[PDB]
Amino acid sequence: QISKKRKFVADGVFFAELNEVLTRELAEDGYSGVEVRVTPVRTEIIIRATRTQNVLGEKGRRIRELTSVVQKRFKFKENSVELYAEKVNNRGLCAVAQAESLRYKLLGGLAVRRACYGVLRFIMESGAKGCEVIVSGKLRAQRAKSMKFKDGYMISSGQPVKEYIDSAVRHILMRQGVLGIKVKIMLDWDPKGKQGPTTPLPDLVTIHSPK
Amino acid sequence: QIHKIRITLSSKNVKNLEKVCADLVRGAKDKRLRVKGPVRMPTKVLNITTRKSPCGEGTNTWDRFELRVHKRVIDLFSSADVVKQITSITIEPGVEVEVTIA
Amino acid sequence: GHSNIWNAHPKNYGPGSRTCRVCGNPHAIIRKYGLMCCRQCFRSNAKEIGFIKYR
Amino acid sequence: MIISEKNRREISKYLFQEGVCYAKKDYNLAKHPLIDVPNLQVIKLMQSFKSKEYVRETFAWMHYYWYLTNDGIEFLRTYLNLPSEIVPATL
Amino acid sequence: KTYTKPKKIKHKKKKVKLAVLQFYKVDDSGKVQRLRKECPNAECGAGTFMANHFDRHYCGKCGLTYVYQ
Amino acid sequence: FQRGLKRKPMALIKKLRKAKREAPPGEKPEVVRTHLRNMIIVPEMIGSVIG
RNA sequence: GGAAGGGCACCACCAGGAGUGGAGCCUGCGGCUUAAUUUGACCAACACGGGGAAACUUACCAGGUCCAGACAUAGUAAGGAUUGACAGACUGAGAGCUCUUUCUUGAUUCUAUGGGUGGUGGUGCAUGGCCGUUCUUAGUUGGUGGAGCGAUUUGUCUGGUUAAUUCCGUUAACGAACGAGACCUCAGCCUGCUAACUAGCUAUGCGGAGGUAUCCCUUCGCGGCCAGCUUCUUAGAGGGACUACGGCCUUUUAGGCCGCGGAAGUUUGAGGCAAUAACAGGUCUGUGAUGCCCUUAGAUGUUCUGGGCCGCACGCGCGCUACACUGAUGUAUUCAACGAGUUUAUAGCCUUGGCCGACAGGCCCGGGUAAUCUUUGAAAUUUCAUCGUGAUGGGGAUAGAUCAUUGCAAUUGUUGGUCUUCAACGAGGAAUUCCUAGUAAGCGCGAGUCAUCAGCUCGCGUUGACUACGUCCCUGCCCUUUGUACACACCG
Ligand SMILES: [K+]
Ligand SMILES: [K+]
Ligand SMILES: [K+]
Ligand SMILES: [K+]
Ligand SMILES: [K+]
Ligand SMILES: [K+]
Ligand SMILES: [K+]
Ligand SMILES: [K+]
Ligand SMILES: [K+]
Ligand SMILES: [K+]
Ligand SMILES: [Mg+2]
Ligand SMILES: [Mg+2]
Ligand SMILES: [Mg+2]
Ligand SMILES: [Mg+2]
Ligand SMILES: [Mg+2]
Ligand SMILES: [Mg+2]
Ligand SMILES: [Mg+2]
Ligand SMILES: [Mg+2]
Ligand SMILES: [Mg+2]
Ligand SMILES: [Mg+2]
Ligand SMILES: [Mg+2]
Ligand SMILES: [Mg+2]
Ligand SMILES: [Mg+2]
Ligand SMILES: [Mg+2]
Ligand SMILES: [Mg+2]
Ligand SMILES: [Mg+2]
Ligand SMILES: [Mg+2]
Ligand SMILES: [Mg+2]
Ligand SMILES: [Mg+2]
Ligand SMILES: [Mg+2]
Ligand SMILES: [Mg+2]
Ligand SMILES: [Mg+2]
Ligand SMILES: [Zn+2]
Ligand SMILES: [Zn+2]
């Protein structure tokens, strides 16, 4: 019975809180993102991850636990909110997944340069028009420094950034401090819209071949 | 068995809201029902202006954050069952549909 | 402490009765529309909440 | 922490029957929303369970999230004297 | 930091070797006599005694006090 | 006064009364010390010694 | 670079407007004082930390509580490890905090050793993220070729042009990738489209008032979901400007000036977004972000009481109010926009209407979770009188008495009323800020903070200008040439 303004703001706040909770809980399991769909007397939450076996667990025990805790914490009516785990298509095109993969590689003792180059190569071989990986923090010395790896196309200004660029930021807790990892992936135009924006770049003009 | 059924649609995305309104209107028309609207209420623009810096240093720069809420009103002259059937059509996420009488 | 003394000071209003729902800090709380988030946390989560920068 | 026997029994019963439990980080809250016990005792009992690996703890947006483990399930079954057939609702 | 007054010591309950033993008296025939009153409160119930203070009787469970003159 | 005094001011006035009663005749009452800086002085407290 | 050439900028100047700097007061900073008057920051700190602190916030000071010290081992221990508590004293205190008196409870604890936990504790010169600045300017970098032993260089340029490394061209370079532009949001035009009882107009029917009072004219009020419609309002789709057209100048170019028409001819106006490389710039006091160090029970943890952060010989910054008649006061008069609003409990948020009251305020019916109700919604201004050059009916600092509202609490006045008091100030030195059109300035309004407090910030509208449309003189920026004994880079 609350006003529309407060209703929409609460919906956004719930989405943000659920995203943060899932990110904290499903860190190692991989968590690309979540989507909330509202239906009459039913709300659907879809978890996107690169490893849905871990998210579901054995016989869906983990997903059932997550559904129960979400329902109890968010005051949802019982048997009204259900969770689903879905594969992420082209995980190499998801900035969050690549950032988590780089975090896992770095936490495993892999050299920063090798891990970043591998991530760049995997992203490029996955159909990305371009990518950029930045590693910041105390590397090899007590003095912090930044490492930048880049290949392919990249835009940084104007409206098309919000659709043609997928970016993520993650922190890695190392022994001597925090490491900052930024992943920025430039998508490619997709007429279907499944793998990229369904809109061409503003300054791209195509002339049909004459008969 | 005829009543003025009021349908209120609210969404943050203009395209989805307009498509849902068009679908509802076409569904009502296909049943030879009388449709009034959709009426577009003035857009609600929630605005928050917060300082960019997480501290007090530097030139005081501000971020203007807006959240736009679009509301539509549709009136149908028919029974409850037919409007309930019409509204059963698939609705995309982000669009809230409320059905009432008068 | 004693029940009548420990945490007995009223907290029905003022900055001490409100905290950020994200970080729990009591400073720079945005109470508009019921966000109840501190300005830093809100600026961090604005895109997820649904607030867009047009100008 | 000193906890009355009835309160511990209620907390353990709820945890085993549900298999999950949350708590807002409010030490002075009179009663837990889902359990009649004060919030502080629920939080501290769950911390004790976590310390010895009976439960998994997640924290986010000033809230706790506790998930029972196999060792926790065994401990709760032994301590509550429930039949082996009965299991948490999650499974 | 510097302190002026002596450090305070938290209260510790005194130890009674057998406090219950002195609440009952057993005769040769086997009859049991209680040397202290029992709280009339239903919640306390039977078996709950009240202290014999030098001006009143005090119950340790419900805190009920009876003053005798 | 219309809003009603709490327990602490009532206790303070009772303590002041007790101190006045125990004062030997022709002598000032003992010291009554309190943290109540917001207490309002009423005529009954005239002659009291307060810290 | 107190070297040359070209170009550019109201954080530069010119020509000007408003000013600031002078007065009172508000608010931040230093100093002083203090138990404490917590602390970060010194163009790019100083109404900044959204930092308008009565309690909390709070980090400071004087005191009193509590463990919210997991887990492991050992000790003690049901012949009881240990909790709580009446009364009296103690205490600022209905804190069993502690002591006296002794009841209750039952392995949940207590003691010791490890290990934890918390900390607005130090370190922003260990860090992440974010933000500011270099830097609002047009700049930045590969590949393959060319030159050089090499660091490097050409590409990225003589010239013209552009707001633009924007283009035309020239060309040992050719092709590219970022920035710019494109982009997206708001505003400006549509009597053309869709649709409106949560927006209106038109005519009609009835009714009130006035006018010759029937019929006619003017003005108001009420209904028509089968009266019509969308000009006015709302918001979706589209259209619209491209310098399109004409005259001149320019390399038959890129382009520029003027001009009709047009809503619009500065990129139509204003914004958002915004490269490479950097700063030991700010933030550990936003974060359950974080390394290391410190502390961790007589605590730097947490809570309660009280005080302080506001303390006043003094200096500075952003501001508000003025110095008056282009005015003050008292009437009459009537034109906005952006927005915000409830747990319904007797009732909580915005509040209409009625009653009470001089005001401040109070009481009673109610509407609104909202284009439905507040909202029938400002001031400057317009209009007519009084005042009459007098620190004066300018000005409103300071202070007295007293009355209400918020709050658990108003004293060091929280704020708001009534009467009374009536300070400096008569236009402000050296210096110094912002600004080129619906702009400056004046005027008010909404939101943030908010139980109560706006002289602040973020937005909104109303009235509405002068001057210029130029330059490199000052302060700076970009490119080229040139000198260097600089490279921590001329604060060398
Ligand atoms: K001045
Ligand atoms: K400032
Ligand atoms: K930093
Ligand atoms: K080359
Ligand atoms: K730290
Ligand atoms: K904060
Ligand atoms: K110059
Ligand atoms: K230039
Ligand atoms: K020379
Ligand atoms: K040189
Ligand atoms: Mg671009
Ligand atoms: Mg741009
Ligand atoms: Mg200047
Ligand atoms: Mg000048
Ligand atoms: Mg001045
Ligand atoms: Mg000070
Ligand atoms: Mg500058
Ligand atoms: Mg305090
Ligand atoms: Mg304080
Ligand atoms: Mg502390
Ligand atoms: Mg720094
Ligand atoms: Mg070469
Ligand atoms: Mg070069
Ligand atoms: Mg129209
Ligand atoms: Mg520094
Ligand atoms: Mg201060
Ligand atoms: Mg300022
Ligand atoms: Mg009006
Ligand atoms: Mg005067
Ligand atoms: Mg006057
Ligand atoms: Mg104040
Ligand atoms: Mg302020
Ligand atoms: Zn926060
Ligand atoms: Zn009893």
UniProtKB/TrEMBL annotation, chain B:
Descriptive protein name: 40S ribosomal protein S20-2
Family per record: Belongs to the universal ribosomal protein uS10 family.
GO cellular-component term (any): cytosolic small ribosomal subunit
Source organism (scientific name): Nicotiana tabacum
Keyword Ribosomal protein among UniProt keywords: yes
Keywords recorded for this protein, A-Z: Ribonucleoprotein, Ribosomal protein
Whole sequence portion shown: 19 to 120 of 122
Keyword hit for Ribosomal protein: yes
An example molecular function term from Gene Ontology annotations: structural constituent of ribosome
GO annotation, biological process: translation
Highest rank taxon of the organism: Eukaryota
Domain Small ribosomal subunit protein uS10: 6-100
UniProtKB/TrEMBL annotation, chain C:
Gene3D superfamilies for the chain: 30s Ribosomal Protein S14, Chain N (4.10.830.10)
Molecular-function GO term, any one: zinc ion binding
Biological processes, Gene Ontology terms: cytoplasmic translation
GO CC terms of this entry: cytosolic small ribosomal subunit
Keywords: Ribonucleoprotein, Ribosomal protein
InterPro entries from the UniProt entry: Ribosomal_uS14, RIbosomal_uS14_euk_arc, Ribosomal_uS14_sf
Pfam families in the cross-refs: Ribosomal_S14 (PF00253)
Keyword Transcription: no
Family: Belongs to the universal ribosomal protein uS14 family.
PANTHER family: 40S RIBOSOMAL PROTEIN S29, SMALL RIBOSOMAL SUBUNIT PROTEIN US14Z_US14Y_US14X
Protein name (record): 40S ribosomal protein S29
Organism of this sequence: Nicotiana tabacum
TrEMBL record, chain D:
Plectin/eS10 N-terminal domain residues: 3-91
Subcellular location field: Cytoplasm
Similarity comment: Belongs to the eukaryotic ribosomal protein eS10 family.
Protein name (record): 40S ribosomal protein S10-1
UniProtKB/TrEMBL annotation, chain F:
Transmembrane segments: none
Top-rank lineage group of the source organism: Eukaryota
Sequence similarity: Belongs to the universal ribosomal protein uS19 family.
Protein name in UniProt: 40S ribosomal protein S15
Gene name, Swiss-Prot/TrEMBL: LOC107829071
